[PDB]
Amino acid sequence: QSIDQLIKARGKVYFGVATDQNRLTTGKNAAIIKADFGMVWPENSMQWDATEPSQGNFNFAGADYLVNWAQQNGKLIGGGCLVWHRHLPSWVSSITDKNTLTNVMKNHITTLMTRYKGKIRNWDVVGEAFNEDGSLRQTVFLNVIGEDYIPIAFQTARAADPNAKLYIMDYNLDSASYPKTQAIVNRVKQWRAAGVPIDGIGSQTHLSAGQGAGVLQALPLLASAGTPEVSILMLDVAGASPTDYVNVVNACLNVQSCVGITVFGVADPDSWRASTTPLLFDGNFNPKPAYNAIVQDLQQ
Amino acid sequence: QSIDQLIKARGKVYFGVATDQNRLTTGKNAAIIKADFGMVWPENSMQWDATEPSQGNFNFAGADYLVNWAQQNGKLIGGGCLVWHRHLPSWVSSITDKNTLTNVMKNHITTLMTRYKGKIRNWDVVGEAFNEDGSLRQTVFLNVIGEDYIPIAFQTARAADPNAKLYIMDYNLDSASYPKTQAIVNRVKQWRAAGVPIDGIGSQTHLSAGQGAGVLQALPLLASAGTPEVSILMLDVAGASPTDYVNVVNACLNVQSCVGITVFGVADPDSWRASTTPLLFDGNFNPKPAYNAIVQDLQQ
């Protein structure tokens, strides 16, 4: 049974997955995505080092492949991450002039979003902007532009494609009593009160065994920032316990503004932490107990 | 034991594998390649549709990642395929002018080879140029430029990087009685006698169960064309029988000019034909019996 169909029947938008061209041409990934998932995200093909490896000179072949495949197969598309420190070519992080970096950042945002205008439901505009203690992470963007880089990024994105839902994303937002969770709420409330067009908070949910239960309290806390949407992004769970996965799904169901869940790949051997077997399909592309538990939870 | 180390001890150059960036950042692929393989080959990041999706718009982020990784980890690198009718963008196949297509082909070859000059041991310059009956395949290059496109491609490649071994590659060269196998031998002989710089024939070896034995006769036939080198390229075997894999390895050992073997990926779930489980590691990244049989054969 399709978990995307079942989550749509419960009033949500999607159950999605990260993928890219060489996943769609190998394994059983394309067949599983066609049958069971409703949204695709680029695993790597829209990151900055993949798309703008020298200034103004874009690499779109990989991203175009994904967008085309999704349109042919009737899937929604997400995109990201537009502004991020972790996937950033050296030419960017070596700029020291505020005006120049602002224009580089706006050109990167506008070029990607314009190319796919109207085709992308969600964009992750800014990612991993917070330290664990809730202060802003001192990346090249913060150091050179200042905290205004976040408002500027979102304003620029809204102008490039008004159809898209604009997200900030981060990880370690999985516990309601962890400082980073309340900090992103505090700052997103302030930014929205200043008119910054942040439509969503995306929680990049990488859990250890037993941590699913805490998402039931963390996700409603994230929703208290008042964004129109929240999502669970790039979900995986070490051990892939049915209990952990069902708890995350039920947190989504319990939060009215949570539109859906994306998992960080199809099958365990293709995970960035494969030894923890953290996904919903095994190395032979069979659905694991957690997959079947999600099916039953969405019916029950 | 490392099959690359063992094949080197038998006088060969490499046991290699196809890979690309997202493979290296997921699963156990990087650890296995470091320990057990001596050469990497882009699974897709150097094809024409990946590298020049529109005229003059080169996309090298993926290929650059692979080349860097290989240099940092002391691995040989192969590249290709430069001229091929598969993976060719529509902008190329819609050219009807002989001078224009000649210069487009030259520029594609020269740009890729120049970027990595000195770093790439082997380039597959022309691929899949023959029909199954041994006549030349009527691709856009044959139709518009004529038969001299093959001499031109090789002469352009030799000028771009004289350090590289230049290969022609094809598939279904696995039986000595098949017309294609004899045809490529005859044509390569005559091209080399006329000074065309073809250094190698690469046999793209995609086998069904039981076909390994035929390679013991086919590979010597390919070597009779007199090229400095031959190789086994992108090897996989439906069912991954030890008998089939050992027969292919022994064909390599028996042919003095065969420099090595590349396998078409690490683990079964990442194969283009994963349901046939045709690789040397399983979906849990454990060596399969075929891996251990190769080790035993090479020790003896």
Side-chain angles (χ1 to χ4, degrees):
Chain A
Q1 296 217 230
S2 166
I3 55 175
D4 181 75
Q5 284 176 24
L6 289 170
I7 211 178
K8 284 171 160 60
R10 298 300 295 269
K12 302 303 189 176
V13 184
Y14 60 82
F15 219 121
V17 64
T19 197
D20 256 331
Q21 177 174 356
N22 70 358
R23 311 288 187 198
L24 295 167
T25 60
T26 60
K28 298 185 182 175
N29 301 299
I32 289 166
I33 294 170
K34 287 180 186 173
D36 297 324
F37 290 95
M39 172 173 283
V40 293
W41 294 73
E43 180 175 348
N44 293 103
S45 65
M46 294 188 193
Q47 303 304 344
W48 196 319
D49 59 0
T51 55
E52 200 189 352
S54 75
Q55 179 171 348
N57 213 335
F58 289 82
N59 279 207
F60 287 121
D64 282 354
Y65 188 98
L66 182 63
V67 170
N68 181 66
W69 186 93
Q71 294 190 121
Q72 290 183 335
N73 290 285
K75 306 300 184 182
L76 295 168
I77 313 167
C81 190
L82 293 171
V83 182
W84 195 5
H85 71 288
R86 205 171 289 282
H87 282 105
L88 197 61
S90 63
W91 70 263
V92 183
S93 50
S94 73
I95 294 172
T96 57
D97 178 70
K98 175 168 185 174
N99 285 332
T100 300
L101 188 59
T102 300
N103 288 337
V104 159
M105 186 188 70
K106 295 175 59 178
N107 181 241
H108 186 78
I109 289 168
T110 299
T111 299
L112 268 68
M113 294 185 67
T114 296
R115 185 174 185 86
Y116 304 115
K117 188 177 178 181
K119 299 180 176 173
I120 309 299
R121 188 191 182 280
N122 297 20
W123 277 101
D124 284 347
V125 180
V126 172
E128 301 189 355
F130 288 82
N131 289 319
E132 299 309 303
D133 68 359
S135 62
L136 292 175
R137 187 191 291 272
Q138 302 181 37
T139 68
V140 64
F141 301 107
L142 190 73
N143 293 337
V144 172
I145 301 170
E147 61 175 296
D148 290 330
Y149 88 92
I150 291 169
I152 294 167
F154 280 94
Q155 296 289 5
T156 300
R158 176 68 94 235
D161 184 355
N163 186 62
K165 290 285 170 58
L166 306 182
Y167 279 65
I168 188 161
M169 67 82 154
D170 221 320
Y171 66 94
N172 285 345
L173 314 177
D174 310 305
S175 170
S177 59
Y178 192 69
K180 200 181 193 184
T181 312
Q182 183 68 56
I184 192 162
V185 168
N186 291 344
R187 287 257 192 191
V188 169
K189 290 185 79 168
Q190 290 181 334
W191 285 320
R192 285 182 49 81
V196 180
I198 304 173
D199 301 311
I201 300 172
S203 183
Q204 186 206 132
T205 302
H206 297 300
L207 301 180
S208 302
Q211 290 185 332
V215 179
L216 289 157
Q217 296 82 42
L219 195 63
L221 183 59
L222 291 176
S224 77
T227 56
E229 307 190 347
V230 299
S231 68
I232 297 289
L233 181 68
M234 310 304 184
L235 175 62
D236 51 33
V237 181
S241 171
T243 302
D244 283 312
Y245 266 107
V246 166
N247 281 333
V248 174
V249 170
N250 285 339
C252 164
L253 298 180
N254 289 345
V255 174
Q256 168 58 232
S257 64
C258 185
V259 292
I261 298 165
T262 299
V263 288
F264 201 24
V266 174
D268 284 335
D270 297 323
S271 173
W272 72 319
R273 52 171 178 173
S275 65
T276 74
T277 61
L279 294 176
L280 296 174
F281 294 80
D282 70 18
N284 289 321
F285 296 98
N286 292 317
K288 289 167 62 182
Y291 187 96
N292 299 323
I294 294 167
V295 166
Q296 289 304 319
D297 184 68
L298 291 174
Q299 292 168 330
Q300 300 277 318
Chain B
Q1 296 262 334
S2 167
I3 54 175
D4 180 76
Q5 283 187 22
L6 289 167
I7 212 174
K8 282 172 159 62
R10 300 294 289 270
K12 300 307 186 173
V13 182
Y14 57 84
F15 217 121
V17 65
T19 198
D20 258 329
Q21 177 177 355
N22 63 337
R23 306 300 182 196
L24 296 168
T25 60
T26 60
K28 298 188 182 179
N29 302 298
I32 288 165
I33 294 170
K34 286 179 189 178
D36 298 324
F37 292 96
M39 169 176 282
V40 293
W41 201 291
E43 191 180 335
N44 189 69
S45 63
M46 294 189 191
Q47 306 300 347
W48 196 318
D49 58 4
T51 55
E52 201 187 352
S54 65
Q55 184 167 8
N57 199 327
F58 289 95
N59 285 214
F60 288 121
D64 283 352
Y65 187 98
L66 181 60
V67 170
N68 180 246
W69 187 92
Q71 291 184 118
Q72 291 174 348
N73 290 286
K75 305 303 184 180
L76 294 170
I77 313 167
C81 188
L82 292 170
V83 180
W84 194 8
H85 71 290
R86 300 188 205 271
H87 294 280
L88 196 64
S90 64
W91 71 266
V92 182
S93 54
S94 65
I95 296 171
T96 60
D97 178 72
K98 176 172 195 165
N99 291 326
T100 295
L101 190 63
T102 301
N103 285 330
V104 161
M105 185 185 75
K106 284 177 177 181
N107 189 226
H108 187 80
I109 291 167
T110 299
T111 297
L112 268 69
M113 291 185 69
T114 297
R115 185 173 183 91
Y116 304 115
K117 190 175 182 184
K119 303 188 174 172
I120 307 294
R121 189 192 182 276
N122 302 17
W123 278 101
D124 283 351
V125 178
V126 173
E128 300 189 358
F130 289 82
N131 290 314
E132 300 309 302
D133 66 5
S135 62
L136 288 179
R137 187 188 290 272
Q138 301 190 351
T139 67
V140 65
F141 303 104
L142 187 69
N143 293 340
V144 171
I145 302 170
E147 295 191 1
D148 285 339
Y149 89 91
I150 289 170
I152 292 165
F154 280 94
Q155 291 281 13
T156 302
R158 176 70 93 230
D161 185 356
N163 179 247
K165 311 299 182 184
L166 307 179
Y167 279 65
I168 188 165
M169 73 83 156
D170 221 319
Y171 67 98
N172 284 347
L173 311 178
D174 310 304
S175 170
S177 64
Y178 199 58
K180 201 178 190 184
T181 313
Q182 184 65 251
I184 191 165
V185 168
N186 290 339
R187 297 305 292 269
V188 168
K189 277 184 180 179
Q190 297 180 74
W191 278 321
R192 285 183 46 80
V196 182
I198 301 173
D199 303 311
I201 300 170
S203 186
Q204 183 205 135
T205 301
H206 296 299
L207 300 177
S208 304
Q211 295 184 329
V215 180
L216 287 159
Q217 305 294 75
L219 196 64
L221 179 61
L222 291 177
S224 78
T227 57
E229 307 191 346
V230 301
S231 68
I232 298 291
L233 182 62
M234 305 310 192
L235 173 64
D236 51 33
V237 183
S241 169
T243 294
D244 284 310
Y245 263 108
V246 166
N247 284 333
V248 175
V249 169
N250 287 337
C252 167
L253 296 184
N254 289 346
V255 173
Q256 189 60 227
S257 65
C258 185
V259 292
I261 298 166
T262 298
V263 180
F264 199 20
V266 172
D268 286 334
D270 301 316
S271 175
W272 69 280
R273 54 172 173 166
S275 64
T276 72
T277 60
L279 293 177
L280 296 174
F281 294 80
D282 68 24
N284 295 137
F285 294 97
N286 291 318
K288 292 161 62 179
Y291 188 95
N292 299 330
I294 291 169
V295 167
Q296 180 72 31
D297 184 62
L298 292 172
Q299 285 174 150
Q300 295 163 183

